[PDB]
Amino acid sequence: LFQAEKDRRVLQMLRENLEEEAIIMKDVPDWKVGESVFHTTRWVTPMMGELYGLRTNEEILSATYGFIWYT
Amino acid sequence: MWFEILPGIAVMAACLFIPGMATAHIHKFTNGGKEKRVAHFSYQWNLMERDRCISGVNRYHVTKGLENID
Amino acid sequence: SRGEYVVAKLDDLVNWARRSSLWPMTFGLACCAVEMMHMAAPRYDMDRFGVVFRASPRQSDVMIVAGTLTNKMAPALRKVYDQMPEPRYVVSMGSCANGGGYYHYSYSVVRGCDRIVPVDIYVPGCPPTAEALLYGILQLQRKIKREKRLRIWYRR
Amino acid sequence: AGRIASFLKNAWAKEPVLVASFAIGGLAIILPSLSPYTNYAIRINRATPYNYPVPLRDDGNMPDVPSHPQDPQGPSLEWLKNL
Amino acid sequence: MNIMLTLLTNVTLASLLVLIAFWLPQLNAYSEKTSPYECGFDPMGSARLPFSMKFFLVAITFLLFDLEIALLLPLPWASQTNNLKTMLTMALFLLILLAASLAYEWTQKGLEWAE
Amino acid sequence: MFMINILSLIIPILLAVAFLTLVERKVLGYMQLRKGPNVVGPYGLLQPIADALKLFTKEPLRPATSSISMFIIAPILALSLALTMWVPLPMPYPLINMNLGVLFMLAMSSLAVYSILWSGWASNSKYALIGALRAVAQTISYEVTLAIILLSVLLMNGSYTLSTLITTQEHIWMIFTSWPLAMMWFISTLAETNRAPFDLTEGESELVSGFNVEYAAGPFAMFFMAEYANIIMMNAFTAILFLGASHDPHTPELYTINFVLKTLALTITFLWIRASYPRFRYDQLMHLLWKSFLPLTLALCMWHISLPIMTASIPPQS
Amino acid sequence: TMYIAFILSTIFVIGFVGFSSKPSPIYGGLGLIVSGGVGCGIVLNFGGSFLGLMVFLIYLGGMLVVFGYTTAMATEMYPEVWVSNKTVFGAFVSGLMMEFCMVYYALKEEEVEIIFKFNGLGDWVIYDTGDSGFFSEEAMGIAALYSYGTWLVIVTGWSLLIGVVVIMEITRGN
Amino acid sequence: PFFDVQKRLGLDLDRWMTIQSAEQPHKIPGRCHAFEKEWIECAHGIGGIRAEKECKIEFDDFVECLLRQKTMKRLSAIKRQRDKLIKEGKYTPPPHHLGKEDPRP
Amino acid sequence: MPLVYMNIIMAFAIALAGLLMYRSHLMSSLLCLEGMMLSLFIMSTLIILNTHFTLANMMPIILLVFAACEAALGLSLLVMVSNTYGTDYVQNLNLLQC
Ligand SMILES: COC1=C(OC)C(=O)C(C/C=C(\C)CC/C=C(\C)CC/C=C(\C)CC/C=C(\C)CC/C=C(\C)CC/C=C(\C)CC/C=C(\C)CC/C=C(/C)CC/C=C(\C)CCC=C(C)C)=C(C)C1=O
Ligand SMILES: CCCCCCCCCCCCCCCCCC(=O)OC[C@H](COP(=O)([O-])OCC[N+](C)(C)C)OC(=O)CCCCCCCCCCCCCCCCC
Ligand SMILES: CCCCCCCCCCCCCCCCCC(=O)OC[C@H](COP(=O)([O-])OCC[N+](C)(C)C)OC(=O)CCCCCCCCCCCCCCCCC
Ligand SMILES: CCCCCCCCCCCCCCCCCC(=O)OC[C@H](COP(=O)([O-])OCC[N+](C)(C)C)OC(=O)CCCCCCCCCCCCCCCCC
Ligand SMILES: CCCCCCCCCCCCCCCCC[C@@H](O)O[C@H](CO[C@H](O)CCCCCCCCCCCCCCC)COP(=O)(O)OCC[N+](C)(C)C
Ligand SMILES: CCCCCCCC/C=C/CCCCCCCC(=O)OC[C@H](COP(=O)(O)OCCN)OC(=O)CCCCCCC/C=C/CCCCCCCC
Ligand code: SF4
Question: Which family does it belong to (chain A) (predicted)?
C-alpha cells in the first residue's frame, strides 16, 4: 500500500513542479520545459531537489533532515 | 545514629525522581496522552509522516480510523 | 528603609554561608597540631560543624597556625597565607603562635605569628585542648556573623 | 603428563587470572564447532524477513512455489515456533 | 536539533556559572597572591620543562589497541549475518591476534616502566 | 516544552549532586564513628547550600603563570559534559533517544577526560602537571578495558540502545548472566570517575590537591559538581546495564523508583569503597588493568561472541 | 536548508587552519579535537552515526597520547600560541582569509576552482529521496566486514600485530 | 606488475568491493545501480579504448547520476528565474507550493 | 559537487601545506599528518554515504586503522630522535646531506 501511495505522491509532485516550471520559464529563450538531463528514456528516481525544490523551507527541512534530527 | 543519613538520601532520591517522571509526563503531554513515537528507522519515520499527513491537523498523534475511511 | 533591609538580609545570607562552611588549610607545625587531629577525631568531630580540612591554600578559608613559627619557616607561612584567596581568617593556636611560648627568648623563633600575618582569634594553651580549639572556632564563627560588608557599602 | 600437571598446578598457584583467561578462550574457540545449535542460529538468521519477498511470475511449472502465503507450499517456521 | 539545543543549554549554564564566579565576589589581586604554588617556597625551575614519561611504549600500544577495539565494536550487528561460521572465525581471529600482541609485549617487557 | 524538559533534567541533577556531597560526608562520618554535618540545618540538610554559596561568593584568582583561556575553558567543558551525559539515559524514557546510545557515552567520556589535562596544563604548576599526567595514564588503562567490557555486555543485548537494554533485562538480570564482566565494569567505572582507590589525578597525600591545586572559589566548585555528576551518571548507567528494572508502559513511575533506588545503592557503594580501601599507585593501576583485566576481558569477549551462536540465542537487531 | 553542513564544514576548515598554522602541539591537539568533533557532526548529518562517533572516539584517544608526548618531548619554556608569534599569526590569518574568500565566492556564484567545479546550492538538494526499512544501511555495510571482507580482516590484523612488534623494535636502542 | 593470482586461483579477495552493482548485504541497491550496470555491460569485452569511444553515453549517464551537475544547473536556473520574477512581482507561487495543501498519505 | 566537498578538500590541502612547511617541532608536523587522514576519512565517508555504496562503508575504518599505525610509527621515531638530541627539533636531523 505504501509503495502505491509513494508512487502517486512522487508523480504528483513531479507534475506540479512541471506546471510551475512551465509558468516560470516561459520567457527564457532556449528552454524546453520537462527536458531530461539523461540520454536514456528509463525512469530515474528523483533527488530531493527535484521534488522539494519549489516548496517551503519547513517541508524541505522535514524531508531532508526530519528523520536524522528526530530524537 | 545511622538513620540520620536517611533524610539526605531521601532528598537525593527525590531529586533523582524528577527527571524521569518529568520526561514521561512531557512525552504524554505533547503526544496526546500516549507514549512518544520511537522512530529508529526510516520505515517508522515514514509511518509518522503519513500519520501527520492523514490527520489533517499536522500532528501525527491524532489518530484516525474507520470513522474517517467512512 | 527598603534598601537598608535588603542589604541587611543579603549580608546575613552571605555571613551565614561563610560561618557555616569553614575550610582550614592542613597546616600544622608542632605539638599543637596533634590537638587539632583530636578535634578532627570522632570525639569532637569538626566536620559536624561544617569545618573541613583542605590541602591547597587556594581552597582554604582559615589558617590555623598551630605550633612554633621559626625564622626559617616565616616566609613559607606568609607565602601560603598570601596564596589563600579572600575572605580569609587566621586562628593562632597555643603559646608558640600567640607569642613566643616556651621558646620566646630564642634566636630562631618568631615571637608570635601576628608579626607575620593578621590574626583573628588567639587560642591560649600549651597545647589548648581540643575543646578549647573548638571554642575558638565557634568564637571565630560568631565574629564572622557580625560582619556587615554590604551594610557598610550601602552607607558608603 | 606429570610435567603438564606440575605446570598447571604452578600456574594455578601463580597466575590464576591467566589460567582462567586461557580456559575461557579455549572453550570459546572449541565449543561452537561441537554445538548442535549453530545450525539453528544460522537458520534463525536466514528466517528473518528484512526486505520484501518479491513474488515470481507464474509460468505454470512451479509446483513448489505457493500461490498464497497460507498454502502448504513454502518454508515453514514450525521448528522455530516450538523452540 | 534537540541535541544541539541541549549542548547549547549546558554550555550556556556553565559559562554563566563562570561569569558569576568571576564577577560577583570582591577581588583583591597582587603579585604575591597570584604566584605559583609549591608548598610555601618558590619553584626552582619552570613547570614547562620536559617531564619524562616512563610509559611511552604503553601509550603507543594503547593507540594500536584502541583501533583494535574500534574494529571490534561493529560485532553486535555482525551477529545477524547468515555467514555465522565466517563471522565467528574472523571475530576470534581478531581477538586472538590482539591477545598475541599483548603476550608478545608482556614477554618482551614492553609493559615495564622505564627506570 | 523541550526546553522545560531540559531544565527538568538539569536542575534536579545539580541538586542531587549537592546532596550527594552531604550524603558522602555523613556516610563516611558514620563509618568512621563520627556523625558528619548535623549542625548547619536539620541533620545538616543546608550544608551543601552553605558550601555552594561560600564558594561562589569567594574570590577566584588566575595565577600569574597560567594560560587564562584554557584555565577557564576546562571547568566549563567538565560541567557541560557532566550535564550532557544524562540525555540518553532511559528513566524509562530518554530525553534524547539515540540509536547508538552507548557509543555516545563512550565518546563523551573520552572528551571529558581533556578537562583534567587542560586544567592541569594551563595552571602552569608542577603539582598540576603531575596530576594531569596521572590522568593520562589512568585514561589509557581504563579506556581500553571499558570499551571491551561494554562491547561484550551489549553483545548480549543486540544493539547499542538503552531502551533495548530494558527490554533485554525484562526477565532476569545481566548481572546474573555476566557477573565477571560486572565486577570488572564496576572497577573500571571507579577508575574512570577517579574514585578511591583510584583517586590519583587529585591525590591529596602525594600532590597538594592534584590537578585543581590552583583553582579557587567558583571554578573549583564546577570541577566538584562535574565529578559528582559523573559518579551518579556512571552508577545510573551501571544500574541500567546490569540491574534491569521491570517496566510497565502505563505506570512508568515504578521503573523510575526502581532505577533511582538501584542508582543510590551503587553510589553509596562507591562511598563505602572510598571509606574502606587505601589508594593505589598509578603504575600499579596500569599493571592491574593490562596484566589482569585485559586478558580476562579478551577471553570473556570471545566467550560472549561464541555463546549466542553455539546456543542459538542471538538477540534481535531492533 | 539551514546550511548546517556548510557551517560545520567551515568550522572544520578553521580547525585545520589552526593546527596547520602550528602554534604548539597542545593547541594543535586542541584544534584537531575540534575538527574531529565537527567532522563527526558533518557525517552525522549526512547519515553515518557510527562512523562519526567512531572517528571522534579514535581521535580523542589519539590526541590523549599526543598531550603526554608533547609534555615530555615537544615542550619549551614559552609555548607558542596563535597570537604569540608573527609567523603563526600570519599563517593563521592567511588560512582564514583564503577560507573566507572561497566561501564568499562560492555563495555569490557557482565557483569553479582551478582544480574542481563546485556548484553553490543545497546539500539538501544533493540527497536521495529513497529510504531503507528496519535496518541501517551504514551499520549493515560496516558489519559486512566479517562476512565479506575476510581478506581485509586478515591484512588489518597482521598489520596491527606487526605494528606492535615494530614499535617495540624501534624504541629498543642499544 | 599485475599478477592476477585471483583470476588464476579462482579467488575473490577484493572484486566483491570493486563495484557497487555487485552483491550487497540484504540486497541493498546502490544509488546508481542501473546506470553502472548499463555502463559495465556496454563496456564489457571491448577494451579500454573502444569502451571510452563507444560507451560514452552510458558513462555520461552514470556520471550524471553520481554527481548530478546538469540537474543542479537546471535547478539553479529555475530558482534564479523564479526569484527574479518574484522580485518584480510577476510570479505568484501556488498554495500547494506555499504550504496550504493536504498532500497524499 | 556540493560546497561541503569543496570545504573538505580545502581542509586536506591546508593540512598538506601544513605538513610540508616545518617550523621547529616534529610533533606539530605529526599533528598535520594526522589531520590529513582525518580529512580523508571525512571525504571518503561523505562520498560513500551519499551514493549508498553499502559494502564500501568498511573502508573508512581500515583507513583509520592504518592512520593509527602511521601515528604509532611516527611517535616511535620521535621518541628515538628526542632521546638522541634532547629536543624534537627537525634542525638536528642534519647529519646526512644530499
Ligand atoms: C598538616 O598536618 C595534619 C594532618 O596530616 C595531613 C592530618 O591528618 C590532620 C587531621 C585531619 C584529618 C585526618 C582529615 C582527614 C579526613 C578525611 C580525608 C575525610 C574527611 C572528609 C573529606 C575531606 C570530604 C571533603 C568534602 C568536601 C569539602 C565537599 C564540600 C564542598 C561542596 C559541598 C561544594 C560543591 C557543591 C556544590 C557547589 C553544590 C552546587 C549545587 C547546585 C548549584 C544546585 C542548585 C542548582 C540550581 C539551578 C538552583 C535552583 C534550584 C531550584 C530553584 C530548586 C528549588 C525548588 C524547590 C521547589 C525547592 C591535622 C589536624 C593536621 O594538622
Ligand atoms: C549556588 C550557585 C550559584 C551562586 C549564585 C550567587 C550566590 C550568592 C547570592 C547572594 C549574593 C549576595 C551578594 C554578595 C556579593 C559579594 C559581597 C562583596 O563582595 O562584599 C564586599 C563589597 C564591599 O564593597 P565596598 O565598596 O564596601 O569595598 C571597597 C573595597 N574595599 C573592601 C577594599 C574597601 O561589597 C560590595 O561591593 C557590594 C556590592 C553589591 C552587593 C549586592 C549585589 C548582588 C546581589 C545578588 C542578588 C542575586 C542575583 C544576582 C547574583 C547572581 C546570581 C543569579
Ligand atoms: C541551536 C544550537 C546552536 C549551537 C550548536 C552547537 C553544536 C556544537 C557541536 C557540533 C557537532 C554536534 C552536533 C551536530 C549537528 C546535529 C547532529 C544530529 O542531528 O545528531 C542526531 C543524532 C541522533 O542519534 P542517532 O545516532 O540515534 O541517530 C540515528 C537515529 N535517528 C536518525 C532516528 C535520529 O545525535 C547523535 O548521534 C548525538 C551525537 C552528538 C555528537 C556531538 C559531537 C561534538 C561534541 C562537542 C562537545 C562540546 C562541549 C562543550 C565545550 C565548551 C568549551 C568552552
Ligand atoms: C559468584 C557470585 C555471583 C553473584 C551474582 C549476582 C549478584 C547480585 C548483586 C545484586 C546487587 C543489587 C543492588 C541493588 C539492590 C536493589 C534492591 C531492589 O530493589 O530489589 C528489588 C528488586 C525488584 O525490582 P525489579 O523489578 O528490578 O526486579 C525484577 C527485575 N526484572 C524481573 C525486570 C529482571 O529485585 C527483586 O526483588 C528480585 C531480584 C532478583 C531478580 C532476578 C530473578 C530471580 C533470580 C533468582 C536466582 C538468584 C540466584 C543467585 C542468588 C545468590 C547469589 C550469590
Ligand atoms: C545550592 C543552590 C543555592 C542557590 C542560592 C539560593 C540560596 C537559598 C537560600 C538559603 C537560605 C539558608 C538560610 C539559613 C538559615 C539559618 C539557620 C539559623 O540557625 O540561622 C540563625 C540566623 O542566622 C542569620 O541571622 C540569618 C541567616 C539566614 C537568613 C539570610 C537572609 C534570608 C535568606 C533569603 C535570601 C535574602 C533575600 C532577602 C531579600 C533580598 C543563626 O543560627 P546559628 O547561630 O548560626 O546556629 C548556631 C548553632 N547552634 C544553634 C547550635 C548554636
Ligand atoms: C597468532 C600468533 C602467531 C603470529 C606469529 C607472527 C610472527 C611472529 C611475531 C610474534 C607474534 C606472536 C607472538 C606471541 C608469542 C610471543 C610471546 C612468547 O614467546 O611466549 C608466549 C607466552 C608463553 O609464556 P612464556 O614464554 O613461557 O613466558 C613466561 C615466563 N615465565 O604465552 C603464549 O603462548 C601466548 C601466545 C598467544 C596467545 C594466543 C594463542 C593463540 C592460540 C589460538 C590459535 C590461533 C589460530 C589463529 C586462527 C584463529 C581461528 C579461530
Ligand atoms: S604552645 Fe606548647 S603544645 Fe603548642 S606547639 Fe608550642 S610547645 Fe607545643
Answer: Belongs to the complex I NDUFA13 subunit family.
* I42 lies in some domain: yes
What is the distance between the alpha carbons of residues F48 and F57, in angstroms, rounded to a whole number?
A: 14
Residues with CB under 6 A from ligand 3: A 67-71; B 39-40; E 3-5, 7-8, 11; F 73, 76-77, 80, 98-100, 104; G 37, 40-41, 44-45, 49
C-alpha cell recorded at residue I75: 611517535
Q: Point out which residues pair with C91 in neighbouring strands.
A: C64, C121
Domain that holds residue C34: 2-155
Cβ neighbours of I59 (radius 10 Å):
21
Helices (H), F85-125: 101-123
By CA distance, what is I58's nearest residue in E?
E71
DSSP state of A33: T
Resolution (A): 2.9
Q: Which of E36, E39, E113 sits opposite F283 (nearest CB)?
A: E113
Q: How many helices (H) and strands (E) does chain H have?
A: 7, 0
**Do F244 and F168 meet the contact criterion of CB atoms below 8 Å apart?**
yes
Q: How many CB contacts within 8 angstroms connect chain G with chain I?
A: 208
Biggest CA-to-CA distance, chain I:
51
Cβ atoms of residues G104 and G12 within 8 Å: no
Q: Cell numbers at residue C119, please? A: 590574626
The CATH number given to whatever domain includes residue I49 is: 1.10.287.3510
D74: left (phi over 0), alpha (psi -120 to 50) or beta: left
Which residues does ligand 1 sit against, CB inside 6 Å? C 26-28, 33, 36-37, 40, 52-53; F 11, 14-15, 17-18, 21, 25, 28, 48, 51-52, 55, 221, 224-225
The structural domain count of chain I equals 1
Is the four-CA dihedral G140, G143, G147, G150 of positive or negative sign?
Answer: positive
* Closest partner CB to G157 (pick from E86, E94, E110): E94
Residues H20, I1: C-beta atoms closer than 8 Å? no
What gap in Å lies between CA F295 and CA A40, rounded to an integer? 60
Assess whether the C-beta atom of C128 lies below 6 angstroms from ligand 7: no
- The helix or strand, by DSSP H or E, that contains position B40, with its residue range, turns out to be none
Domain-located, residue I23: yes
In a domain, I41, yes or no: yes
Would you say C23 and C53 are in contact if contact means Cβ atoms under 8 Å apart? yes
Q: Is there a contact between G143 and G25 (Cβ–Cβ < 8 Å)?
A: no
CATH code of the domain in which C110 resides: 3.40.50.12280
Q: Domain range holding I66? A: 3-92
DSSP SS3 for C64: strand
Residue of F105, F113, F141, F154 to mutate for G, most G C-beta atoms under 10 A: F113
* Distance, CA of F157 to CA of E80 (rounded, Å): 12
Q: Does A69 touch chain B (CB under 8 A)?
A: no
Estimate the share of chain C in helix, then strand, then coil, as percent rounded to the nearest 5: 50, 15, 35
DSSP secondary-structure letter at C104?
S
In this structure, is residue I68 part of a structural domain? yes
The angle that helices F68-84 and F101-123 make with each other, rounded to 10 degrees, is 160
Strand-pairing partners, residue C123, are C93
Residue of B55, F127, A39, B47 lying closest to B37 (CA atoms) = B47
**3 state SS for G27-66:** HHHHHHHHHHHHHHHHHHHHCCHHHHHHHHHHHHHHHHHH
Residue that the C-alpha cell 521534488 belongs to: A51
Instruction: Give, for E42, the enclosing helix (H) or strand (E).
Output: none
Interacting residues of D32 by C-beta distance below 8 A, sequence separation 6+:
D38, E88, F306, F309, F310
Helix (H) or strand (E) holding I56: none
Q: Please give the Cα distance from G70 to D35 (Å, whole number).
A: 52
F287 touches B55 (CB < 8 A): no
Q: State which of C29, C34, C37 you would mutate to test the pocket of ligand 1, scoring each by most atoms of that ligand within 8 A of its C-beta.
A: C37
